[PDB]
Design an enzyme around this catalytic site. Structure first.
Site, PDB file in Angstrom:
ATOM      1  N   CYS A   1      19.356  27.966  51.513  1.00  0.00           N
ATOM      2  CA  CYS A   1      20.155  27.620  52.630  1.00  0.00           C
ATOM      3  C   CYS A   1      20.994  28.832  52.995  1.00  0.00           C
ATOM      4  O   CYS A   1      21.307  29.764  51.971  1.00  0.00           O
ATOM      5  CB  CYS A   1      21.140  26.298  52.474  1.00  0.00           C
ATOM      6  SG  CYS A   1      22.280  26.434  53.604  1.00  0.00           S
TER       7      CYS A   1
ATOM      8  N   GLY B   1      25.318  22.777  56.379  1.00  0.00           N
ATOM      9  CA  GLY B   1      26.106  21.728  56.053  1.00  0.00           C
ATOM     10  C   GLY B   1      25.862  20.325  56.779  1.00  0.00           C
ATOM     11  O   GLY B   1      24.598  20.151  57.081  1.00  0.00           O
TER      12      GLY B   1
ATOM     13  N   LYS C   1      34.327   3.020  39.021  1.00  0.00           N
ATOM     14  CA  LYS C   1      35.055   3.671  40.301  1.00  0.00           C
ATOM     15  C   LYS C   1      34.462   4.777  40.836  1.00  0.00           C
ATOM     16  O   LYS C   1      35.138   5.965  40.537  1.00  0.00           O
ATOM     17  CB  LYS C   1      36.713   3.833  39.662  1.00  0.00           C
ATOM     18  CG  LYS C   1      36.776   4.612  38.511  1.00  0.00           C
ATOM     19  CD  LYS C   1      37.944   5.393  38.309  1.00  0.00           C
ATOM     20  CE  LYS C   1      38.055   5.873  37.020  1.00  0.00           C
ATOM     21  NZ  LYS C   1      39.075   6.942  36.856  1.00  0.00           N
TER      22      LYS C   1
ATOM     23  N   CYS D   1      35.465  -5.491  20.372  1.00  0.00           N
ATOM     24  CA  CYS D   1      36.498  -5.702  21.792  1.00  0.00           C
ATOM     25  C   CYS D   1      36.326  -7.165  22.189  1.00  0.00           C
ATOM     26  O   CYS D   1      35.472  -7.854  22.225  1.00  0.00           O
ATOM     27  CB  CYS D   1      35.860  -4.820  22.807  1.00  0.00           C
ATOM     28  SG  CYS D   1      36.728  -4.230  24.233  1.00  0.00           S
TER      29      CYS D   1
ATOM     30  N   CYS E   1      43.702  -2.311  28.123  1.00  0.00           N
ATOM     31  CA  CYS E   1      43.364  -0.816  27.532  1.00  0.00           C
ATOM     32  C   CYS E   1      44.170   0.322  28.178  1.00  0.00           C
ATOM     33  O   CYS E   1      44.276   1.243  27.812  1.00  0.00           O
ATOM     34  CB  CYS E   1      41.887  -0.447  27.655  1.00  0.00           C
ATOM     35  SG  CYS E   1      40.663  -1.808  27.190  1.00  0.00           S
TER      36      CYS E   1
ATOM     37  N   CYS F   1      45.962  -2.168  22.840  1.00  0.00           N
ATOM     38  CA  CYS F   1      44.719  -3.119  22.622  1.00  0.00           C
ATOM     39  C   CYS F   1      44.793  -3.448  21.070  1.00  0.00           C
ATOM     40  O   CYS F   1      44.956  -3.024  20.376  1.00  0.00           O
ATOM     41  CB  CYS F   1      43.310  -2.093  22.838  1.00  0.00           C
ATOM     42  SG  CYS F   1      41.967  -3.372  22.533  1.00  0.00           S
TER      43      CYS F   1
END
Ligand SMILES: Cc1cc2nc3c(=O)[nH]c(=O)nc-3n(C[C@H](O)[C@H](O)[C@H](O)COP(=O)(O)O)c2cc1C
Ligand code: F3S
EC number: 1.4.1.13
Lengths: 1472, 81
Positions: free
Chosen positions: A1, A232, A937, A1102, A1108, A1113
């Site tokens: 590119c 881009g 996440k 667990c 946590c 814990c």
């Protein structure tokens, strides 16, 4: 590119221009995508001015006479297959060019050579031809250009009206011409022999070569476009088209006149983002504005909130921001009007752009420095470009323009300082509000009843409502979510729960929201939507609000201000309307608003205060969608605005999803009343209502900014109505009609189930006598809550089964899991074979199948080292593959102990942080890993609390103990596809043994990115889901991000099969795999390898406490304090038994199915059959859009290639063939070479050889050195070990010193260059990324994002730009020049020694976590003196020598920047 | 090349109709387009009545309830790429 432009200053034509253009284009073959066929490309284009003399001579040869005025050539692609369409196209163009008065001179068939292009790209090659026309009416040139453009657009519309596809017009003008195609960017001059004649001489030239994701080429999609180039992609293109449709009707100009009517649908159909940008740019510039003004209005400079620019430019930027909505996204624009030529960057400056001026009046610019060969002694200035800058060339008088002079000339043209104060703000109205009008807050019973009317339980009002008003931020989660999807649920789920937020993979880089907050905005403008082509004062009279969300007092103030033009609308519908009351109510409102807006009202305020026992509240989201889309399709949204009051939104997701529909403001008057009643009950303590409301507003602002940065947008003005969301479980018709543009992969419930649930909840709330809010479980399990995944009985049964090592107990566990009602997608199918059952004694072995499963990475920071090592050894004991994840790992675990167990991991990761990434860390594994975006996440970096970083984890991550570590969500190395390819090449160069994999998260349209990365030689793709675990993250991110891996995986398989790319890359899935049935299903869908994840952790002990994130814990797994660590009960035998049982179960189900081996089932989608839930739900989820498939053909349905995919080798290979004595007897060496720009990552394979032979610190400094001459390529000296000295004479391209590990790199110009060192750029952007050890000496100015994430290295440079030393952690940096704006953002370790004369540092620094002062301690004085001494004796810069000379009076000009949290840890007190 | 039609005088369906239709199609190969390739042709097809019972069996298998009245089937060609 690549994209580049050449120009002459004066403006005289010359063959050297196009010569250098073609030459520079011929050297862009290292950034391309070389494939096996080697002939097919992906698009390349050049753009020059018209060679008048050539066409004049040709037409004189034909037999006509060459007129005095200039000619105009039109280049077109005509259909080739059928001879019935070319006649039609010729007819059309002639009819529409002879209807105005111009004279046709004739047609011409350009000679071409189709021998070099491949076969697949030849199957769609159109026929190229050209027509010649000439001005004969004696009219001026500008009228000629305007009339030709109008004629071209009319022809395009008229030919689109006949559905005669496969027709395109390159460019029709008398100044410019374009030669573009789908060939290879190297052989252009062979495809077009016209450019080989000695007469095609222009004043300017543009060249571009793109990097396409998919593989199917279309000729009309090659750059440059009409009067623009680009690099881009633009993030905010969905809302841009809608706002353009809104603006279409309120524009006119006498320059067009009658033919103005012919240009109503400005943006055409079937184009990329740059195509729409180009069409809008052209139709705007043809009205009278120049190029720089249009650029300033389209992509405005980031409006800094400081005094670093004269206020005239500030007024100009305010006006441009008011007149037109910005266009975010990574872009390096090179626009060329017939008069000006402007090269500029975007708001953030995400891509590089460097230019050189020769001593011959010739300017060159592009993405690299050594593309075109320039002499060394004929360089006047080597310059770069930062954010928002722009360099201009004016050929009308032959004048150059740098940034400040050009912008000053621009702001000279109009009195901008007098038009800005005509408007007003809101604070002026707030401050004059009389202290009166207190509304009696509703009784507690009324509030509780209205809250039950929307099922807002009590856990909400204390989990994510108390912290937002108390602390000043959002809550924190600790694990993945196991609640079912919004459609499969049973309780009344809010309509917002059916909307999943979007993000951006490697195609678009996300932007951080904790450092670069200056470049983002939330300004809303009332009374600004109007004309775009004209200029007057009727566009600076408006009202401006700082935040799109409003309280109750300010909302009533605004309503009192608006006066007698605000029309209210009731959003309540009678519950006794009938089976179809909702449709009637929606029709009624969508007609009533259109009635009211024409009567004289300019504001629509949608309210729902009329909710009563007989009338329920229409979902505000759906009403807003319908109203906005009707105003858009009715050409009325521009005429008015829209303000909404809600009664169901409490968290940050609701305001975001409601703004993303098209509303302007959002007001929530229930949350404020609940907050007041909770405050007067004395719960917050002694925090008055005002401060609590202020903190709540700040938290909502932070949430909106985070959710807006999760995608790559900068300003809300382009996100409003952009529809950046994914819908699951909604009907095709409802979404495709009431919502602007949202892809719904599976059709879902219509308007029956929605109204049914709404009326049922209203009845159960108001019709009965309720007194207390229900407890409810959505974030933590309860007995009266919905069906979660990890149930207590399930965990206990699994634990007893894995401890007792009993197969019957595990079988009972699997049965217990399978006997639940539908919870996820995989609960809606059923296996169905057709063959005879095979006895279980005939399927493959248990170990042969066990060698597939792996356990995903677990950060050493989140987990305890005990469980880490336990899982590691449990996976390495049998022979399968394990993971390590981010957070690095202890070196002492590289070799086994005496017991015979290896604690080393088999796979290492490369996240966005690059903490433990050194030379040694990347050579003790058999598989690499890139953490593009995390599963649980996405659009965020790895988080870790402040008191969890102990001594061990800090010495492992090279960080100062006691800090909340937040890895930057952006990657700073993958800004596009080619940068990903470069990183892949780097990782395959550093380790010549292993492979490299990429991680992704499922979403719509992921197949394009999959096919893109498949061309980047990557060989393993890990597709995550949205039900995985994490260490710490906001609950809004956990519950509202991603999609179940079903659609993503089933679409990636289809796409990678469709382009013959499946047979080259493996496929591995993970996320929510519990028992054998889901494993067999995932293998049926097209996967090969698998993961376990949290399931395995349950075998480890667990208990899903979901705490946590507090280092507490109870079972002692996610802990970093010595007290809880001694509670561990982990044992690898548990994991061995778990894997053995899972393999046995899969063997049994496969044997019962009818086959013999897993490798004979992958891809067989026909072995499944969808089963309905029945008639008890009336939902219509059809999963067929996933069961689809394309026949593979001859290749296999799985990967059929052993070993990694080989990649070409650079010069360093030949280096190894010469450095025999260093690797046979170990003697010093000293080499020299002539290095070029097309040699990437020089000095890395040698580093691998050294670290495998000797190690990291096994040698003396300066053992082997390499003198390179000429400019160097990209990623210089990446991962250099101590002992190597790379001395380059010239300048580096990009990413120098990425991951330095003790080496020494020096850059100095050629000693025969008459350049002042400290007044020229010498390095590109992103210098010393991920550095941990070493010394860097420069001799010029530096790029952008300088020395980010440095850990223990030292660097000396002569200048910097924006975001310098961002998020630095340790080391030493000395800059001798002019630092940029926003310096040392988030620096929590190290130092900075700045040298500034004009006292400009207190104006650019980011005075949040650092302090700047004068030098006071003699120890640091001597240290700085010796550093400057080493610099001047190493590279010999004149400026450094002059500084060293006069030392008595210069140290009082130096400033020192030191982090705050490091004052109490420095052995030398910086104060007195 | 050619077009043919088979019909029942009375109007009661049977498998023999489709059987003989396929049989007829299996005998007009020579009047078509033969080339050295051996696979490609120039297009052909058949047109019959809706076998209601088969779609009823399908919709009963999927999990819904078979309606008494007549169904309607639609065949669509979508862009594949
Ligand atoms: C405790 C824990 C820590 C994790 N840490 C990371 C991490 O640091 N980086 C990362 O990319 N994924 C991380 N993951 C996600 C895993 O890579 C993978 O997606 C997860 O094991 C799948 O979850 P599942 O068992 O529910 O299917 C983590 C997961 C868990 C449970
Ligand atoms: S939530 Fe985490 S801290 Fe232990 S008990 Fe469960 S693995």
């Amino acid at each position: 590119c690549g994209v580049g432009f050449i120009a002459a200053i004066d403006g005289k034509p010359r063959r050297s221009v196009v010569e250098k253009g073609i030459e520079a284009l011929k050297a862009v073959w290292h950034r391309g995508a070389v494939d096996a066929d080697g002939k097919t490309g992906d698009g390349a284009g050049i753009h020059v001015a018209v060679p008048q003399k050539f066409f004049k001579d040709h037409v004189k040869v034909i037999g006509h006479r060459a007129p005095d005025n200039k000619l105009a050539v039109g280049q077109v692609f005509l259909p080739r297959i059928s001879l019935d369409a070319q006649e039609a196209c010729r007819c059309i163009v002639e009819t529409e060019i002879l209807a105005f008065g111009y004279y046709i001179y004739g047609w011409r068939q350009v000679p071409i050579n189709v021998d070099i292009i491949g076969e697949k790209a030849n199957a769609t090659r159109p026929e190229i031809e050209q027509i010649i026309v000439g001005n004969n009416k004696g009219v001026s040139d500008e009228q000629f250009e305007l009339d030709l453009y109008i004629i071209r657009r009319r022809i395009e519309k008229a030919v689109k009206g006949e559905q005669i596809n496969d027709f395109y017009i390159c460019s029709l003008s008398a100044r410019s011409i374009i030669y573009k195609g789908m060939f290879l960017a190297e052989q252009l001059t062979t495809f077009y022999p016209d450019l080989l004649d000695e007469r095609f001489e222009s004043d300017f030239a543009i060249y571009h070569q793109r990097y396409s994701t998919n593989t199917f080429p279309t000729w009309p999609l090659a750059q440059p476009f009409r009067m623009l180039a680009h690099n881009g992609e633009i993030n905010t293109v969905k809302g841009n088209v809608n706002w353009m449709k809104a603006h279409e009707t309120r524009m006119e100009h006498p320059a067009f006149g009658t033919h103005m009517q012919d240009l109503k649908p400005v943006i055409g159909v079937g184009l990329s983002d740059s195509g729409s940008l180009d069409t809008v740019f052209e139709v705007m510039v043809r009205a009278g504005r120049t190029a720089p003004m249009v650029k300033m209005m389209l992509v405005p400079q980031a409006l800094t909130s400081s005094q670093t620019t004269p206020d005239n430019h500030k007024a100009l930027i305010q006006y441009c921001n008011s007149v037109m909505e910005p266009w975010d996204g990574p872009a390096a624009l090179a626009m060329t009007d017939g008069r000006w030529v402007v090269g500029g960057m975007d708001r953030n400056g995400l891509r590089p752009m460097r230019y050189t001026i020769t001593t011959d009046g010739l300017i060159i610019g592009g993405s690299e420095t050594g593309m075109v060969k320039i002499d060394e002694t004929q360089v006047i200035e080597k310059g770069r470009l930062g954010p928002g800058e722009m360099i201009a060339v004016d050929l009308q008088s032959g004048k150059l323009y740098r940034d400040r002079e050009l912008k000053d000339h621009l702001a000279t043209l109009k009195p901008w300082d007098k038009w800005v104060q005509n408007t007003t703000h809101l604070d002026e109205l707030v401050k004059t509000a009389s202290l009166k009008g207190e509304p009696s807050d509703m009784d507690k019973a009324e509030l509780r009843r209205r809250q039950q009317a929307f099922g807002l339980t009590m856990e909400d009002m204390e989990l994510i409502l108390h912290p937002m008003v108390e602390d000043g931020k959002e809550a924190i989660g600790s694990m993945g979510d196991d609640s079912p999807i919004a459609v499969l649920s049973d309780k009344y789920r809010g309509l917002h729960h059916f909307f999943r937020q979007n993000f951006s993979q490697v195609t678009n880089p996300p932007i951080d929201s904790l450092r670069e907050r200056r470049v983002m905005s939330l300004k809303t403008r009332l009374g600004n939507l109007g004309n775009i082509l004209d200029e007057d004062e009727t566009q600076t009279r408006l009202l401006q609000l700082e935040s799109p969300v409003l309280t109750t007092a300010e909302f009533r103030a605004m309503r009192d201000y608006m006066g007698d033009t605000a029309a209210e609308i009731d959003a309540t519908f009678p519950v006794d309307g009938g089976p179809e009351a909702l449709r009637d109510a929606l029709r009624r409102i969508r007609q009533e608003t259109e009635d009211a807006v024409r009567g004289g009202a300019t504001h629509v305020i949608l309210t729902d205060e009329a909710m009563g026992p007989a009338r329920a509240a229409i979902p505000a989201i759906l009403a807003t969608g319908a109203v906005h889309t009707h105003l858009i399709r009715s050409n009325l949204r521009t005429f008015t605005s829209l303000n909404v009051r809600t009664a169901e939104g409490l968290d940050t997701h609701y305001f975001a999803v409601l703004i993303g529909v098209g509303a302007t403001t959002v007001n929530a008057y229930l949350a404020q009343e609940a907050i007041a009643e909770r405050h007067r009950r004395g719960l917050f303590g002694s925090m008055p209502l005002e401060k609590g409301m202020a903190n709540y507003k700040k938290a909502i602002d932070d949430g909106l900014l985070k959710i807006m940065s999760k995608m790559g947008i900068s300003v809300i003005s382009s996100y409003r109505g952009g529809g950046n969301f994914e819908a699951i479980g909604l009907s095709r018709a409802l979404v495709a009609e009431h919502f602007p543009a949202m892809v719904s992969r599976i059709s879902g419930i219509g308007l029956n189930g929605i109204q049914k649930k709404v009326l049922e909840q209203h009845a159960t709330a108001y019709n009965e006598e309720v007194v207390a809010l229900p407890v409810g479980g959505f974030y933590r399990f309860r007995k009266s809550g919905d069906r979660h995944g990890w149930e207590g009985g399930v965990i206990h049964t699994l634990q007893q089964a894995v401890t007792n090592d009993s197969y019957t107990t595990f079988k009972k566990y699997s049965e217990q899991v399978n006997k639940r009602p539908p919870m996820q997608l995989r609960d809606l199918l059923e296996l169905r074979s057709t063959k005879a059952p095979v006895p279980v004694d005939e399927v493959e072995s248990i170990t042969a199948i066990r060698k597939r499963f792996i356990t995903p990475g677990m950060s050493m920071g989140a987990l305890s080292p005990e469980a880490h090592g336990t899982l590691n050894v449990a996976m390495n004991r049998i022979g399968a593959k394990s993971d390590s994840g981010e957070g690095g790992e202890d070196p002492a675990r590289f070799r086994p102990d005496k017991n015979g167990d290896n604690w080393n991991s088999a796979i290492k990761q490369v996240a966005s942080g690059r903490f433990g990434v050194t030379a040694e860390y990347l050579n003790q594994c058999r598989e690499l890993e890139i953490k593009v975006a995390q599963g649980a996440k996405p659009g965020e970096g790895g988080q870790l609390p402040g008191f969890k970083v102990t001594e061990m984890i800090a010495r492992l991550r090279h960080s100062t103990p006691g800090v909340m570590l937040i890895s930057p969500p952006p990657h700073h190395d993958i800004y596009s596809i080619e940068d990903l390819a470069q990183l892949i090449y780097d990782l395959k160069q550093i380790n010549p043994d292993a492979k490299v994999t990429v991680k992704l998260v499922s979403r719509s349209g992921i197949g394009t990115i999959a096919a893109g990365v498949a061309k980047a030689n990557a060989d393993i793709i890990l597709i995550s889901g949205n039900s995985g675990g994490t260490g710490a993250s906001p609950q809004t991110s956990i519950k509202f991000a991603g999609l179940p891996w079903e659609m993503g995986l089933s679409e990636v398989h289809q796409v990678l099969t469709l382009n013959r790319l499946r047979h080259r890359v493996r496929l591995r899935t993970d996320g929510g795999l519990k028992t054998g049935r889901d494993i067999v299903i995932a293998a049926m869908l097209g996967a090969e390898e698998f993961g376990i994840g949290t399931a395995s952790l349950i075998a480890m002990g667990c208990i899903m406490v979901r705490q946590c994130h507090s280092n507490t814990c109870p079972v002692g797994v996610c802990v970093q304090d010595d007290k809880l660590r001694q509670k561990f009960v982990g044992t690898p035998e548990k994991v061995v038994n778990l894997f053995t049982f899972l393999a046995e179960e899969v063997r049994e189900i496969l044997a019962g199915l009818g086959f013999r081996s897993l490798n004979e089932v992958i891809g067989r989608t026909d072995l499944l059959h969808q089963v309905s839930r029945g008639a008890e739900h009336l939902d219509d989820l059809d999963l067929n859009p996933r069961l689809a498939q394309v026949d593979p053909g001859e290749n296999a349905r799985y990967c059929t290639l052993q070993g990694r995919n080989e990649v070409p080798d650079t010069l360093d290979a030949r280096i190894v063939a010469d450095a025999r004595p260093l690797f046979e007897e170990g003697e010093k060496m000293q080499l020299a070479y002539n290095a070029r720009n097309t040699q990437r990552a020089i000095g890395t394979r040698l580093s691998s050889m050294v670290t495998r032979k000797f190690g990291m610190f096994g040698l003396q400094p300066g053992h082997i050195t390499i003198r390179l001459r000429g400019t160097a390529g990209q990623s210089l000296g990446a991962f250099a070990v101590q002992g190597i000295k790379l001395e380059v004479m010239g300048d580096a391209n990009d990413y120098v010193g990425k991951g330095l590990s003790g080496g020494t790199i020096v850059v100095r110009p050629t000693t025969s260059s008459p350049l002042e060192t400290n007044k020229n750029t010498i390095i590109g952007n992103t210098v010393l990324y991920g550095a941990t050890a070493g010394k860097l000496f420069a001799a010029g100015q530096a790029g952008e994002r300088f020395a980010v994430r440095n850990s223990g290295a030292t660097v000396v440079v002569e200048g910097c730009g924006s975001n310098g030393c961002e998020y630095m952690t340790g080391g030493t940096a000395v800059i001798l020049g002019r630092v940029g704006d926003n310096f040392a953002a988030g620096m929590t370790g190290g130092m900075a020694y700045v040298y500034d004369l004009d006292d400009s540092l207190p104006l650019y620094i980011n005075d949040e976590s650092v302090i700047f002062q004068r030098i006071e301690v003699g120890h640091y004085e001597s240290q700085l003196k010796h550093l400057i001494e080493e610099h001047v004796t190493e590279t010999q810069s004149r400026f450094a020598a002059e500084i060293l000379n006069d030392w008595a009076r210069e140290v009082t000009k130096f400033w020192q920047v030191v982090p705050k949290e490091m004052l109490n840890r420095l052995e030398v007190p910086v104060h007195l």
